[PDB]
């Protein structure tokens, strides 16, 4: 076969250890899912330094630690029918734990807004670095993709679907590793779900086609991400969403001539319209991806342990540094509490 005795035994044992890890991580997740944190800080505990994305860089007054404070206007969430999605986001973020998932440190609320205070990730969005450099070499792209594969293996084992993978939602930390942000569309889903949501270029065909869909939409989105990282542009590329959607459902994808055959084979199996053939949706699960030739040089444990040398370390001048984010142009807490009943659980 493809592997000899030593390699097949090591791989089988490694895969069993993954199962063991994931069973323990689910037990830990469920305890927090069932008893969520709430009201663990107040606005007066921080200084507002600068707007970073609203998301504000803030400084905790007692510790001097810097954080990214996401501010949600309760009234705008209701008008947008994102109430359940916003409740999903905070409940999920406070329950998960993984080295490539942004860490929610505090959350709280007041008359007008919801606040989520997360660890500050100073390296900026992958998006910026990718557009600046053009494209990532395949080893560079693979380093990031491996982190997403492990993160999705973790999330999906908890029955969580992420639903908004893209370079805009991936931050680079001080060691050059990825931090997944933006859990606004993440949902706990035992089997299928039906909401039409996500970002056009990254939507799986079954979403566009208004089907009940499952966690395999995330594996399709991984295909889009790897393609975009390695090409510099995504595989289904057009000025208007309707044109993007037509390309996605066609079952056709074209590749740059510099893509390796290994990469093209992986991407054809991720960007597979037929769900009975899509990697990540088959009997062998995530192992079809982790055991693919394009990942043959990936030491999955070493990636998880953050012991692999990153391809790129972002410039970092000091603890408050915002140089890897953009510039943006006050906080208005009202005297009357708004949409109190809709956000009781937050």
């Amino acid at each position: 076969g493809h592997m000899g005795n030593a390699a097949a035994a090591k791989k089988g044992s490694e895969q069993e250890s993954v199962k063991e890890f994931l069973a323990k991580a689910k037990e830990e997740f469920l305890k927090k899912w069932e008893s969520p944190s709430q009201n663990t800080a107040q606005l007066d505990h921080f200084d507002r330094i600068k707007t970073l994305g609203r998301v504000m860089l803030v400084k905790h007054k007692e510790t001097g630690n810097h954080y990214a404070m996401k501010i949600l206007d309760k009234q705008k969430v209701v008008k947008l029918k994102q109430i359940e999605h916003t409740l999903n986001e905070k409940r999920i973020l406070q329950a998960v734990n993984f080295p490539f998932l942004v860490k929610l440190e505090f959350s709280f609320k007041d008359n007008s807004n919801l606040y989520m205070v997360m660890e500050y990730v100073p390296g900026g969005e992958m998006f910026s670095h990718l557009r600046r450099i053009g494209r990532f070499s395949e080893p560079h792209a693979r380093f990031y993709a491996a982190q997403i594969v492990l993160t999705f293996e973790y999330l999906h084992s908890l029955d969580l679907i992420y639903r908004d993978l893209k370079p805009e939602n991936l931050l680079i930390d001080q060691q050059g590793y990825i931090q997944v942000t933006d859990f606004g569309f993440a949902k706990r889903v035992k089997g299928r779900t039906w909401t039409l949501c996500g970002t056009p270029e990254y939507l799986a065909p079954e979403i566009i086609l208004s089907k009940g869909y499952n966690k395999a939409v995330d594996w399709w989105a991984l295909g889009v991400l790897i393609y975009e990282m390695a090409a510099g542009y995504p595989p289904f590329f057009a000025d208007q969403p309707i044109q993007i959607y037509e390309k996605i459902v066609s079952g056709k994808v074209r590749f740059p001539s510099h893509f390796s055959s290994d990469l093209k084979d992986l991407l054809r199996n991720l960007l597979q319209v037929d769900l009975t053939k899509r990697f990540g949706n088959l009997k062998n699960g995530v192992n079809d991806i982790k055991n693919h030739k394009w990942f043959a040089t990936t030491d999955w444990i070493a990636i998880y342990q953050r012991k692999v040398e990153a391809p790129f370390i972002p410039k970092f001048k000091g603890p408050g540094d915002t140089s890897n984010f953009d510039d943006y142009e006050e906080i208005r807490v009202s005297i009357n509490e708004k949409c109190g009943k809709e956000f009781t659980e937050f």
Binding site: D164, K166, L196, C197, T199, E201, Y233, A238
Partner: peptide, 13 residues
């Protein structure tokens, strides 16, 4: 030709 800037999510269609 296609979108080169940051891309917004959609809540419906």
């Amino acid at each position: 030709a296609g979108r080169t800037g940051r891309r917004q999510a959609i809540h419906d269609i």
